[PDB]
Amino acid sequence: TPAFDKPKVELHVHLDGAIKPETILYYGKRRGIALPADTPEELQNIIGMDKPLTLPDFLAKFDYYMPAIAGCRDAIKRIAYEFVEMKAKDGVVYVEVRYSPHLLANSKVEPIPWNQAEGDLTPDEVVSLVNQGLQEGERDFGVKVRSILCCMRHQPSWSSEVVELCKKYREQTVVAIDLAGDETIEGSSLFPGHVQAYAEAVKSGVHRTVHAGEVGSANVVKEAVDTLKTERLGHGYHTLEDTTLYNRLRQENMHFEICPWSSYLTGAWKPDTEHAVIRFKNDQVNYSLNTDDPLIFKSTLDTDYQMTKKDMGFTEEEFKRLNINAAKSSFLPEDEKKELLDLLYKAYR
Numbered sequence: 109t110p111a112f113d114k115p116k117v118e119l120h121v122h123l124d125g126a127i128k129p130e131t132i133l134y135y136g137k138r139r140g141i142a143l144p145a146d147t148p149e150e151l152q153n154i155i156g157m158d159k160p161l162t163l164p165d166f167l168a169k170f171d172y173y174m175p176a177i178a179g180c181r182d183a184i185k186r187i188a189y190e191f192v193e194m195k196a197k198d199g200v201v202y203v204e205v206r207y208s209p210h211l212l213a214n215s216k217v218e219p220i221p222w223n224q225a226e227g228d229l230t231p232d233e234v235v236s237l238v239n240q241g242l243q244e245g246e247r248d249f250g251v252k253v254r255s256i257l258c259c260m261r262h263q264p265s266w267s268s269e270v271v272e273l274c275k276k277y278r279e280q281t282v283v284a285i286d287l288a289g290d291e292t293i294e295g296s297s298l299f300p301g302h303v304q305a306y307a308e309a310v311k312s313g314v315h316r317t318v319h320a321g322e323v324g325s326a327n328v329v330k331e332a333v334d335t336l337k338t339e340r341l342g343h344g345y346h347t348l349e350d351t352t353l354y355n356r357l358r359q360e361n362m363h364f365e366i367c368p369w370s371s372y373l374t375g376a377w378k379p380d381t382e383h384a385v386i387r388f389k390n391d392q393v394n395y396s397l398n399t400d401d402p403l404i405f406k407s408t409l410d411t412d413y414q415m416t417k418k419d420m421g422f423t424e425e426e427f428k429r430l431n432i433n434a435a436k437s438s439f440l441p442e443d444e445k446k447e448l449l450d451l452l453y454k455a456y457r
């Protein structure tokens with residue numbers, strides 16, 4: 109089946125969205141939380157979706173499961189490990205995984221997320237754990253994994269912690285800072301907390317990417333580029349609204365992290381229209397193919413090499429164009445990006 113049986117690069121996938129039903133059932137059972145169901149396969153079909161939903165409809169999915177993972181040191185380290193394992197199945201050679209350390213903790217964070225009482229798991233040692241399982245999976249599974257820490261739009265207060273986390277843990281996997289989600293809250297991009305944390309990123313040489321243009325206007329993409337100084341765009345679909353900002357990102361050539369299957373189950377793209385990616389194809393844009401959230405969207409990388417091969421005419425030459433672009437625009441040190449380019453060029457010819 110797989111549309112592309114070659115190795116892949118993936119840049120845009122969220123850790124708290126690539127958990128296996130099994131492990132949630134497992135920690136929820138052995139901590140008390142009680143899911144909506146007790147078998148592995150009926151949790152999936154109510155925690156995963158298959159028709160566009162709404163934000164609210166969408167954020168409840170996390171309130172099923174996140175209480176049974178957060179908090180527990182053991183779980184935090186497990187999902188990282190198991191994340192690397194399931195990516196190897198996808199045929200990924202290099203993958204950048206993103207997540208918010210605060211949302212996985214139940215102390216030193218205000219407010220405490222998901223609904224949990226206080227404890228002693230702090231954002232700082234949450235990322236250290238994740239770091240562990242990630243490096244553990246890498247050498248157990250043969251997939252190169254780096255980390256991305258996410259700032260939360262609605263909580264500029266956590267932003268300055270994230271940059272520090274990114275700098276303290278640089279080398280230990282984490283390679284950049286991110287922004288999401290819900291980019292429709294007014295002027296979130298210009299939240300002082302956010303912009304000055306991104307300013308710290310630039311000062312300290314931390315790579316930068318931003319969720320922009322997925323469900324927001326072309327102006328959110330703008331302030332991400334000109335203010336937050338992003339090097340990559342998360343989605344960046346709506347920059348088709350402003351043709352001069354588009355031609356200018358053609359020309360700077362910026363990376364768009366496309367998520368095709370995500371964009372339908374969210375509503376970002378309506379079916380009875382261009383998909384933003386066909387245009388990036390025809391126009392030779394720098395872009396990638398990515399999964400976003402394999403748990404919530406019942407999918408694997410192969411569901412969206414498939415959707416593009418099948419409903420939109422991608423052939424395998426663009427498939428491989430797009431994975432060498434993804435490798436180029438990776439947040440990898442100049443030497444390592446170059447050993448990864450070497451592997452792929454030879455694997456593809």
Ligand SMILES: NC(=O)c1cn([C@@H](CO)CCn2ccc3ccc(NC(=O)NCc4ccccc4)cc32)cn1
Nearest residue numbers: 122124125162163166206207208289290291323374401
């Ligand atoms: N798909 C995603 O955007 C997404 C975000 N996360 C995590 C972080 O790794 C954040 C979870 N989260 C907590 C508050 C919050 C607010 C908004 C969003 N997501 C968002 O607004 N996505 C756009 C969207 C619109 C409509 C439907 C579905 C998604 C995620 C949020 C996981 N998946």
Ligand SMILES: [Zn+2]
Nearest residue numbers: 122288342400
């Ligand atoms: Zn995302």
